[PDB]
Structure formats: structure tokens, C-alpha cells
Amino acid sequence: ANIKSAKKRAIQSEKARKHNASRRSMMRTFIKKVYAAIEAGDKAAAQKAFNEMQPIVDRQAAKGLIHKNKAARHKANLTAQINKLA
Amino acid sequence: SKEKFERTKPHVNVGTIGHVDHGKTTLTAAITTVLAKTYGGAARAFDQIDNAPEEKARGITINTSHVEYDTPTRHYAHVDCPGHADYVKNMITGAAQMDGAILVVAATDGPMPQTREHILLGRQVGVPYIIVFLNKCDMVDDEELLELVEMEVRELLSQYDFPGDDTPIVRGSALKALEGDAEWEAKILELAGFLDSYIPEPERAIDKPFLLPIEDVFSISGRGTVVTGRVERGIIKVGEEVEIVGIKETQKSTCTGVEMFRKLLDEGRAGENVGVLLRGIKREEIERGQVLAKPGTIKPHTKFESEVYILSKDEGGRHTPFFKGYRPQFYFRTTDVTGTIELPEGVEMVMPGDNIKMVVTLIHPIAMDDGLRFAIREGGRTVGAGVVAKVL
Amino acid sequence: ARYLGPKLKLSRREGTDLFLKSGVRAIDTKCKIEQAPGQHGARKPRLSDYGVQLREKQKVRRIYGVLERQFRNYYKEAARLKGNTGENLLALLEGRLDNVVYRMGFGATRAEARQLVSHKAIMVNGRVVNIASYQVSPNDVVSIREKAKKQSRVKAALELAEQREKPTWLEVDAGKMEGTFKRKPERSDLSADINEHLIVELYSK
RNA sequence: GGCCCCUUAGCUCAGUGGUUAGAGCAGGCGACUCAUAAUCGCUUGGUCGCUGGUUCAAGUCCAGCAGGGGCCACCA
RNA sequence: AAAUUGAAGAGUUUGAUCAUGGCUCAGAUUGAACGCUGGCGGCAGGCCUAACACAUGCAAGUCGAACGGUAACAGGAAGAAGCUUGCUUCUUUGCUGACGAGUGGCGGACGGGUGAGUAAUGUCUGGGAAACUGCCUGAUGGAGGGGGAUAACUACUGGAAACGGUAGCUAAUACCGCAUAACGUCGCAAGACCAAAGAGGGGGACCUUCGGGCCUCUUGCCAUCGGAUGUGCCCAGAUGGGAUUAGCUAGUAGGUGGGGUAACGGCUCACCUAGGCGACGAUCCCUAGCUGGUCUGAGAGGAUGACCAGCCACACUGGAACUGAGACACGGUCCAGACUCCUACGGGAGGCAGCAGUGGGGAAUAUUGCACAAUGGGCGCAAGCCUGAUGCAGCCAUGCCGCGUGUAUGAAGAAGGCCUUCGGGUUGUAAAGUACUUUCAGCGGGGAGGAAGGGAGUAAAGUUAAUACCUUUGCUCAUUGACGUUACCCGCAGAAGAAGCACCGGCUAACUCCGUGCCAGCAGCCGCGGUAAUACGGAGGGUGCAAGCGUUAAUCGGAAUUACUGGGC
Numbered sequence A: 001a002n003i004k005s006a007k008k009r010a011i012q013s014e015k016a017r018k019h020n021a022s023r024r025s026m027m028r029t030f031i032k033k034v035y036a037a038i039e040a041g042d043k044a045a046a047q048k049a050f051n052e053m054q055p056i057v058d059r060q061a062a063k064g065l066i067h068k069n070k071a072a073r074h075k076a077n078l079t080a081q082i083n084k085l086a
Numbered sequence B: 001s002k003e004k005f006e007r008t009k010p011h012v013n014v015g016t017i018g019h020v021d022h023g024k025t026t027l028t029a030a031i032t033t034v035l036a037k038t039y040g041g042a043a044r045a046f047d048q049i050d051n052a053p054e055e056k057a058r059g060i061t062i063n064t065s066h067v068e069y070d071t072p073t074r075h076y077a078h079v080d081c082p083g084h085a086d087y088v089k090n091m092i093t094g095a096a097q098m099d100g101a102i103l104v105v106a107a108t109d110g111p112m113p114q115t116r117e118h119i120l121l122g123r124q125v126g127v128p129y130i131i132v133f134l135n136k137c138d139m140v141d142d143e144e145l146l147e148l149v150e151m152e153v154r155e156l157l158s159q160y161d162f163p164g165d166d167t168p169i170v171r172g173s174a175l176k177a178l179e180g181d182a183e184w185e186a187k188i189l190e191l192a193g194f195l196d197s198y199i200p201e202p203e204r205a206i207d208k209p210f211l212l213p214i215e216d217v218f219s220i221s222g223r224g225t226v227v228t229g230r231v232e233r234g235i236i237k238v239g240e241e242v243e244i245v246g247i248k249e250t251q252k253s254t255c256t257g258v259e260m261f262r263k264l265l266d267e268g269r270a271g272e273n274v275g276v277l278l279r280g281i282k283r284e285e286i287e288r289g290q291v292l293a294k295p296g297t298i299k300p301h302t303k304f305e306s307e308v309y310i311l312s313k314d315e316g317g318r319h320t321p322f323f324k325g326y327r328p329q330f331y332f333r334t335t336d337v338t339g340t341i342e343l344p345e346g347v348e349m350v351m352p353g354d355n356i357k358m359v360v361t362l363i364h365p366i367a368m369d370d371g372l373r374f375a376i377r378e379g380g381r382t383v384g385a386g387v388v389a390k391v392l
Numbered sequence C: 001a002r003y004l005g006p007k008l009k010l011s012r013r014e015g016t017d018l019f020l021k022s023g024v025r026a027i028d029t030k031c032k033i034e035q036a037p038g039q040h041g042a043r044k045p046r047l048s049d050y051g052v053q054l055r056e057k058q059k060v061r062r063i064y065g066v067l068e069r070q071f072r073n074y075y076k077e078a079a080r081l082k083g084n085t086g087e088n089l090l091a092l093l094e095g096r097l098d099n100v101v102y103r104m105g106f107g108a109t110r111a112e113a114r115q116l117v118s119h120k121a122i123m124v125n126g127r128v129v130n131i132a133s134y135q136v137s138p139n140d141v142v143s144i145r146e147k148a149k150k151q152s153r154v155k156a157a158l159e160l161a162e163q164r165e166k167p168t169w170l171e172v173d174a175g176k177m178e179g180t181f182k183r184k185p186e187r188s189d190l191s192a193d194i195n196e197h198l199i200v201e202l203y204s205k
Numbered sequence D: 001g002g003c004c005c006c007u008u009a010g011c012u013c014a015g016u017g018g019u020u021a022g023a024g025c026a027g028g029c030g031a032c033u034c035a036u037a038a039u040c041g042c043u044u045g046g047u048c049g050c051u052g053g054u055u056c057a058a059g060u061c062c063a064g065c066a067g068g069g070g071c072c073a074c075c076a
Numbered sequence E: 001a002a003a004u005u006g007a008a009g010a011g012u013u014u015g016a017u018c019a020u021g022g023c024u025c026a027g028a029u030u031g032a033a034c035g036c037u038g039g040c041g042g043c044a045g046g047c048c049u050a051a052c053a054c055a056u057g058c059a060a061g062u063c064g065a066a067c068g069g070u071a072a073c074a075g076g077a078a079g080a081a082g083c084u085u086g087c088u089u090c091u092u093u094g095c096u097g098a099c100g101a102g103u104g105g106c107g108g109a110c111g112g113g114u115g116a117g118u119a120a121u122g123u124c125u126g127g128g129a130a131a132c133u134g135c136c137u138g139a140u141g142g143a144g145g146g147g148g149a150u151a152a153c154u155a156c157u158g159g160a161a162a163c164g165g166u167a168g169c170u171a172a173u174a175c176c177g178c179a180u181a182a183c184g185u186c187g188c189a190a191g192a193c194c195a196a197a198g199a200g201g202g203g204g205a206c207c208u209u210c211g212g213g214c215c216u217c218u219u220g221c222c223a224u225c226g227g228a229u230g231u232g233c234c235c236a237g238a239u240g241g242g243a244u245u246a247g248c249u250a251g252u253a254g255g256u257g258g259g260g261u262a263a264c265g266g267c268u269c270a271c272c273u274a275g276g277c278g279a280c281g282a283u284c285c286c287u288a289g290c291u292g293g294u295c296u297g298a299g300a301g302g303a304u305g306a307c308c309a310g311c312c313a314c315a316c317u318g319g320a321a322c323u324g325a326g327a328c329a330c331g332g333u334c335c336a337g338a339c340u341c342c343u344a345c346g347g348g349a350g351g352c353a354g355c356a357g358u359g360g361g362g363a364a365u366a367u368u369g370c371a372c373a374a375u376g377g378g379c380g381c382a383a384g385c386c387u388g389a390u391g392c393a394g395c396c397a398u399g400c401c402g403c404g405u406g407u408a409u410g411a412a413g414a415a416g417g418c419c420u421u422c423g424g425g426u427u428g429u430a431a432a433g434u435a436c437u438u439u440c441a442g443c444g445g446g447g448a449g450g451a452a453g454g455g456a457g458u459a460a461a462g463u464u465a466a467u468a469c470c471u472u473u474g475c476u477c478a479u480u481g482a483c484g485u486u487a488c489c490c491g492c493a494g495a496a497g498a499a500g501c502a503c504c505g506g507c508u509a510a511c512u513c514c515g516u517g518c519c520a521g522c523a524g525c526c527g528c529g530g531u532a533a534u535a536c537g538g539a540g541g542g543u544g545c546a547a548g549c550g551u552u553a554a555u556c557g558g559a560a561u562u563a564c565u566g567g568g569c
């Protein structure tokens, strides 16, 4: 740049992306683990995966990386999917 | 960004004149290099001067080149002139503004027609002080012929009212001095010493409305149109309003910026070669031959009467009388314009040695007032000179 | 913004003295009124509708001394008001300052009044007004400044205008030279040699 | 600032320095008509762009300008 | 009471007439341009063409009362030049005020520029439901305890530079768990699950490892339901020309399921159904930002979108996304391309449609100015810093408005021009003469308003254990103006410094001589000139405007000559 005030901002922006990517990856990994658990047909495994997936998405939504409605959609879709099968 | 100028040492103008290819660009480069070597910071180069393609392709000079140096007596501005016989107007422009002249004569070639022409036009413009510097003494060093060359150049100078038997002569070669040997640059020091001693300080009359003849026009990118010239008499300051009067119709503008050798000057006193930036002027409008003066100082004229003396015989010029319809080129200040002349009842013939009264009309008007010195020249021959008698 | 030439030529063209001189003498011994100016004065060719309209408009303009732009603005303003346009135009041009100064005897002619107004010598309601066309409203006191009361021209013209008719709406004391309005004027108080409907026709084309 | 080009009657044009620079289409005069066109009877016309030089001798050989046209530079 | 008072024709087809029908004229206006001329001020306006290319300098920062520290500056002691034994001279302290670079917070998405793209992904009017929202505000609550890191810095070192790398050390309102939890999320239910940050002022009652503990006050920090502002989404109607453009569409029209977004939705995929738009003009090609409004007209209409206000689109050209409450971001990031620069040849840097300025294009459009004094804006507790927004100044008869270039009396009806009937008439009271006034400009002298506030002192009342810090109100005391030599007033000498342009056959206001001779020329339309020209050229006289006057370009009117109001075969 050329104004010595946006360079600082670029620095925080790249640091923030580098910090956010790991959290997004971890959250996606846990959710897709849940999806695979439904896929296999193992209701106990899917239920357990949901049980320790709930805290992750809720804490991330509180941190703000996602939105309350996003976590609610994930939680509700997974609950309906799991409770359908038995 | 720019560096200002420190008004501490006196300013004066010098120039070089002589026959073609007697080392005039080389001498200027050698003198500036030596002077910066002993004390200073100029140290000019050769090819940096001649920038035009024809300059480097043909090994000649087409115009006048500006340089600067100083000694712990004064500060000198130098002008480099051509030597050919069809670039005369540039040499006249160079000689008009220069207070001091140095004439270059080579012992190999001796005096040549162009040297005589340069001396004659210097006399007809009125250069007060000329110093002669012999050139190419590296290849000839015989005492028994340099005396003959010195006698010849003294005769040439003395023939036309210059002091010849008291003016000094310096012998040396510029090429060795520019090379940088251990002994051939002392001749440069002697030339500079004789330059300072032989040029007494002239008057600095800055007590009348500002006037500036125009000699060259430039376009500085980003900034605009710039005129160049040496201030004759007066003083100008940034923000003042001046007026352009000359061949074309009169206009006005303001001096919004001054410079000198790309070094800023707060206020230009009379007698300095400076460049002035003018607001809101397209390049083709302002041309050399015009005048830039303070408002209410001079006005244009077309017809006026003067006293003209055709050059007497055995001095050059011509050999025949003139009559009605004669259209010679008047050279006034810096401008050459061909106009018509008229002689009174009787004295129809023109004799070489009789000064007569004429009335001259010029096609392009010029900023003229009573008491101006103008020369006469046409057809590659200068015929006479005179001064203004009456403005009509 | 004024006229700076001969004065009697205007009346000679209009065929009537337009009060442009003081009145020390009579008009008949200053100019040949019945002879129009120039090399062509004897002949009297016949006019048209445009001719009569233009001649009347020029007559009124030369009487009061108002150039064309102000007159056109006056016409627009008079048509802008409520009522007849001719009466409105007469009221508007009768209510400007230099006309009132002339009608109150302080000046020999309209030009004398104009010099007095424009040289800052009149107080209206105590304050200095400098402008010739300053519009004046009822109940305005007009007076001269105390520095100018020693002039000879004003005293000469004070006891020279009583031969003319006394205006019925400019109550004046000539001793302390103090004047006042009461209300607007009317056609009953104005001369009978103007046909304003010609002007209304001319600007309605 | 430098180099190369064009200048003949109103339009279009010829004119290889030995003595007044010619052609065509034009044009004026005398008759006839209110005035012409046509038919007649005579036909005048020139700074060779200007100025100055060399030749015994020049628009024509030589130089400087006038104006226009085609390129090349230069950057307080 | 008022917000209405409004409607004009002429010239030209023929030997003459009536009718039809085109051409021309009289009015109003403009971001204007050219020619001649040019005294002053007030309020406005000023690249319409190359969204062509840009030299130089400014246009976005602030917080120490979040933090680690001391690069610069100002506050002490001892050594220590001489003694008037500290007169004077020099070196050693982050304890304090302040603060360069660094972590952290907020802003940088506002304000400013341009109209290229866009005929409906936009705008205008009227409605709606499936959403989010920093700062501002109300209510009810929480505010417990731990942990691992890194910049600056220290040592080494790469590199032309930009910019790096290696090994240790350190602070938080930087980051990550834990502790509890709801009116909150999911769930029929039962249940399962998620947060926090500390700073600053003063000190009485009570103790120190003398760090502070301890009381109160101001401000923050986190969760839920509201108010306001703002933004995203949907529907109906209105929004230029061409049929010498008639058919267009396969994610295309609908349905089920999965996914995705702050939110509904073919937004996206797998499969099913075979539909959907179109003479009420789809599709296709050309031109174009839209509105409140502006000019014109008696209205109905016609032309249009310069200045100001609302909305939209763009930021050298083509793409894409991160960060954030808000962007796919004018003075940010990544890649590609065309131009311009630095380079040690390995590699680097740049984007005026921000303010001035330059070249070029054009009939044609301005200074590389002053200041934060006032109004708004960012940051901060405040003081205060920044602001080419803004308030002013400069250049331009570009527009509207105002004023002056003197006022009287004066026949000898003078010289001088011009005409003549030779008698005389005219320019003309015009001049010259005599008597008065000083607007504006010239010089000098005095001198409002835009200024609210901020600072200091003092007192009363508030909350607390407290006369303490802090807050409110009063009062008191010296200062804040670029414009600026403001506006305005007074004095001086003197009519003293200040008038041009078009027209004169008819339409249309205003007439005669000389020159020329269908030649030279004029012309908005009829038309003038062939040897006695009110029409060409000059002069005298006259008419119309006036610091302007004319010509060219463009729009409505007249034109009932696109006829809805209001025409014909």
C-alpha cells in the first residue's frame, strides 16, 4: 500500500484468516464425521457423534465464526436425520 | 525539491568565438573540468553537452551551449558559439549578451576567415573585452612561428579598434588539459586569472521598469511555458505582472516562477541569465524577437528615422552604392528584420565613408524607443550600423 | 444609464413640451416645436397602429426618465398586482423617490432631483437613501440634510414651483422643508394626455 | 533552431543567358439595343514574388528575404 | 382575507378573385461561441469534446485513562572545575510529565468524483413477509478459577533495494479450556449444550512480604426480551425507436428429497412430470442513467434532466476472495494483460472519473492560493490532533440586479460640415460663456457583525463513612477572526478619471447628396444594380438599445401545419 494505516490492517486480516481456517476445518471435520456415522447405519455411533458435536458448533457460534441460525440448522437437520432412522 | 541560489559572488557573462574545429567545445569542457578540479563542483562532460543527433553524428556545433563556473573573485556564466558561416544568427545571439569574449586561434591553421567574421560581428555588437587563447600547442612548439601567429592575430584585433598590442595571449592545448596530465592544466589557471583581471565589474542599473529580451522558448512538462534571457535593466519578482510586446499583438501574463541553471532564484536582479515561467501561454504564441516588459514601459513602432553609416572601404562590407528599394536586414537587440529605407532630397548615391540620414520602415513592429543601437546586414555581408534619431 | 445629449429634441419629436426645463421662460422661444428635428422636419407622414403605440410608450418613458428594462419590469409588476394594469403602472412610476422629490419643489427638473438624491442629501424617515428609484410608501417623511440647507439652488426652486399646481397628496412645509405622503394617487390627480390602454396593448403582443 | 521544395496575362500554360517574354480561352473600343447575346469594323494589354551580386551581356548563374508546403530537433 | 385575469397577426403562387398548401417574420429562453467596444459593485455560474495520457505537492487518522518500554524533550542526588566552598562548569536516575517504533481498540464501507455500463438484474407510485443490524437507548441478570504462546528486544545472518531467516526472553482489554446458568438453542417430552476484562480518582475506620490490602465513586466487560436508525427480499401498475425483426426457451416451467444463505427462492444437485413466454409485440437490433423538477403554452400538450436534493452504477482492463455489524472494498489483498519507471540482471515499483497543474481534442470553460475563525465529521474522559469537506480569496461582461459618465441659465440662433428654390434651412441650447453639487473611483482618519465557547478561581446542592474525587447550578477573572486595509461613517482638492453597437424599400420605428453602372456588391422572405439607385459604397441627418450591441447554433409559440380539447377524403 501507500498510506501507513492499511498495511497494519492487511497484517491483521491475514492473521485472522490463518486463525479462522483451522476452526472452520475442525468444525467441518466433526460434522462430516457425524454424516458418515448416519451413513453407516449405526444409530449409536450417530447419536454419540451428535452428542459431542453439539458443544463444538455451539461454542463456535458463540465465538461468532458462524451465526446462531447456522448452528441451529446443523443441529436440527442432524436431529431429524438421526431420529428418522432406527 | 529544488536548491536555491546563494547571492554571494559577482555574476558576469563570457563567451567563446573562433574558426570552425579549433576546439571550442573541448576548451569549455577542459576549463570547467580544471576549475572544478582545483576548487568547485562543476566538472562537465563532453557528450552530455552535444545532445542532438546531428551534433554527435557530424562532429559539429549548431547552437550556443550554456555553462557555469566560479573563482574566488567572481562567478562566471559561459556561452559556446558555432563557427560556421550559415549559423550566424546563433553566434550574434551569443555575442549580444556576453560581456567578455575569448577568441580561439590554432597555430596549425592560423587566422581564418571565420575568425575575422566573428571579430567583426563582435565589434558591431560591441563586446568590450576580448582575450585570445592559442590552441593546439601540443603538436607545434617552435618559438620561431608562434611569434608570426601572434603578430597576425594582433594585427587582426588592432585593425578594428581593439587593444591588440596590450591584450595577452595564452598558449596551450585543451585536449591535454581535459586528459588530466600534471602540467598542461596550469595554462587554464592562467587563462582564468587573466579573465578575472581583464574584466572590470560593469554597472548594474536596476532602477527602471523591468525589461527582458526573449531568446529561447521551452515547455517544461507538468509546469508550462518558459522563456529564457538575460535581464537588461530592472528587477522582477514572482507574482508580478508583465506584458509581452513584439511582432504579434501585445498580451499580458504574470511571472509565476523564476529559475537559473535549474537553481531557484528568489528575485532576479538586472544582469542575470534566467528562465521565467509564464502562466496560461501556449508555446507557439511567444517567440524569440519579442520583448517581455513591465506594463507602461515601451510600446511598438513601425517607421522611424535614424542616421546610418555604410561601412567605409578596406574594412569588409561592400563596395557599391545603394538607392531606393534597398531592403537590408536590421539587427536590433537580438532580432533581424528586413525593412525599407528612404534618403532625403539629394545625396541619392551612397558612398563608403559618408554617414547619411535615413528613414526606415519595418514590416513587423518591435518594442522600440528613441536611442537604440542597431546594425545593418544582408546577403551574408554586414554593411553598416547606426543609432536611433527620431521615433515616428 | 441616463441620457446625455440635447433636451428639447425629445419634446420636438413628441410634439409637446415634456417639462424637461425649469420654466423660467416659455418653450416657444427656445426651439421650433412644430418642426421635427433634422433635415426632414416640415413633412408630417401618417402613422400606423405600431407607430402610435411606440410613440406613446416613448413619450411616457421620456417624461419620467426610465430605460427599457426597468419599464418592462414595471409592466410585469403592474400586471402582477390586483386591478387595472394602466392605473397600476402609473401608481408604480409615481411612487419612486426622485419623482416625489421633484413634485415637492426641491429640484428645478427631474435631473436636479436626481442629483440631489444621488448625492446623499435626503433623509427618508431619518435615514439616508441614495437611490433614484427607491419606492416610497405612505406616511414617509422626506427631508433635506442639514448640511445642504445653505444651498442656493434649493432655495431658488423652493419659491418657483408654487406657480405649478400644488399636489393633493404631498403635504409639505417649505420652511423646515419637510414633506409627507398620505396615500396613493389616482387618475383623478394625473394628467389627461395619456392613454394607458395603448401601452397595455403594446406589451401584450 | 536545421535541411528540401513551389512563385510567368483574369484562368490554364509555353519560354535551352545574344536584345523589347509568347499561346489559348478572355477583354476594350465604333455601329445596332432600354441593356445584352449573335453578326460586323479596330485591338490594348507584363514588378517574370522582391532585393542585392557575377558575367561585355541575365526572370534564366550566385546570395538574403516574402508566403505556403514535407520532414528533424530542443526542454527553466 | 389572497394564493387568481385567460386566447392578436403579417409577407409570398395570378392580369385581378376566392379556396387549398408549403416557405419566411414579429415573443420567451441558453452551462453558449464569434466580431466591434468596454467605468463600478451585489448575488450566482464556469471542459457540453478524449470514461484520452499524466510531472510535482497536498487530500485519513487517533487512543498512554488497554500494554511491554524510553528513540527525542522537560522534572532530583553524588561525584565533582573554584570559591563569592555548590558562584560557574562536566558525568552518572524511566521515580514523573510526555512520547518514536511494536502488540491491542476504533475508524478507514463516511465524506468527495464521474455517467462509461444499464430499456429493466434499475427508477417512480402503492402494498407485503421469510431477515439481519456497530455505535445510541430501556429492563432484568452475570461478572469464579486456570493455562500455552509471540511482536519489540538480545545474538547470528541473507539481500542492490524492497524485504528477510535462524536461536532465547517477555505484557495484556491478545488467545484457549474449565467452573454455573437461564425468559436462550435443539427437542412432543424428558432432557443435552453455550460467557465474561479490566481500568482511573480520593482516602476515614482496620494492617503490611511496606507491592498493596480495604471503602466509595466514574467508565467499561458478557447473556436474553424491547425502541430507533440502516440494509437485504417479494408483488401490481408506469417507465424510448424499428415488423424492410415472428417465433423464443432444456435449469428451461412445475414436484419430491439432500445441501446452502442472516432470510423465502432452480440458489444448487439427483430423479420425476412436459411444460413455460408471445400480435395487450415475446425474441432480435439501435439509442439512453431514472425522479423531484427546468424552458415553453390560455389550457391540453411539446422539448428536456446544466446548478441543488433522493435513488442507482463505476473506480487502468479482466477475474476472485479473505477481514469485518456493514465490501466481493476510489487513495486494500492475490492472479493475468497493455503502458511508465529503479535495478548490482537475480529482482522490484505505479494507477488524478479527490484539489490545484500539464499535453492533446475542440468554436469554447478558471490559481500548482489562505485557514480550521464558524457548520459538520473520525479518534479520545477531557485538553486536543486530522479534514484541498467546508468557510474565503483569485481569473472570466457568462447570467440577473443596482449606480455613475454632472446640474442650471444661456441666441451671436456664432464658426464648421450638409442641403438649397441661392432667399435660406439644418446640426442646435447643442457648443463656447456664467453660476452650483461631489454619487463612484483617488488619498487620509475613525470603526459594527459573523464569538458560541474553552481555561482559571470561588460558593450552594447532590452520592458516599466522609468536609474526599466527581456532577449540577450560579457567580467572578483575563483570552479565541483567515475573510480584513470587512461592512459603515467622517474629511480633503477638483466636473475633475469614465460611450458604444445595429438599423432607415415593404413586413418594421426612421431620408437626402456624391461614386459606380446587371460591374463591384447586398439579401430572414418578396426582391435591388443595364448611366438620374430612399435597397450596393461613402458622407450629412434620423430611429432603437445601452456597459453593452449584433451574427451563428438549439427548443416551444405563432401552426387548427398530427386536429383528445381541435382537421379532412
Ligand SMILES: Nc1nc2c(ncn2[C@@H]2O[C@H](COP(=O)(O)OP(=O)(O)CP(=O)(O)O)[C@@H](O)[C@H]2O)c(=O)[nH]1
Pocket: B019, B020, B021, B022, B023, B024, B025, B026, B027, B059, B060, B061, B062, B081, B082, B083, B084, B135, B136, B137, B138, B172, B173, B174, B175, B176
Ligand atoms: N591534440 C589536440 N587535439 C585537439 C585540440 N583541440 C581540439 N582537438 C581535437 O579536435 C577534435 C574536434 O575539435 P572540436 O573541439 O570539436 O572543435 P570545435 O571548434 O569545438 C567544433 P565547433 O566549431 O562546431 O564548436 C576533438 O575531438 C579534439 O580531440 C588540441 O589543442 N590538441
Ligand SMILES: [Mg+2]
Pocket: A025
Ligand atoms: Mg484439511
Ligand SMILES: [Mg+2]
Pocket: B024, B025, B050, B060, B061, B062, B080
Ligand atoms: Mg560544440
Ligand SMILES: [Mg+2]
Pocket: C002, C003, C004, C065, C111
Ligand atoms: Mg438624464
Ligand SMILES: [Mg+2]
Pocket: C001, C002, C003, C065, C066, C067
Ligand atoms: Mg434617464
Ligand SMILES: [Mg+2]
Pocket: C079, C080, C081
Ligand atoms: Mg401575479
Ligand SMILES: [Mg+2]
Pocket: none
Ligand atoms: Mg400571456
Ligand SMILES: [Mg+2]
Pocket: C205, E026, E027
Ligand atoms: Mg408576438
Ligand SMILES: [Mg+2]
Pocket: E009
Ligand atoms: Mg395569420
Ligand SMILES: [Mg+2]
Pocket: E009, E010, E026
Ligand atoms: Mg406582424
Ligand SMILES: [Mg+2]
Pocket: E012, E013
Ligand atoms: Mg405563393
Ligand SMILES: [Mg+2]
Pocket: none
Ligand atoms: Mg404578379
Ligand SMILES: [Mg+2]
Pocket: none
Ligand atoms: Mg398558411
Ligand SMILES: [Mg+2]
Pocket: E027, E557
Ligand atoms: Mg406568446
Ligand SMILES: [Mg+2]
Pocket: none
Ligand atoms: Mg468578446
Ligand SMILES: [Mg+2]
Pocket: E035, E551
Ligand atoms: Mg459578427
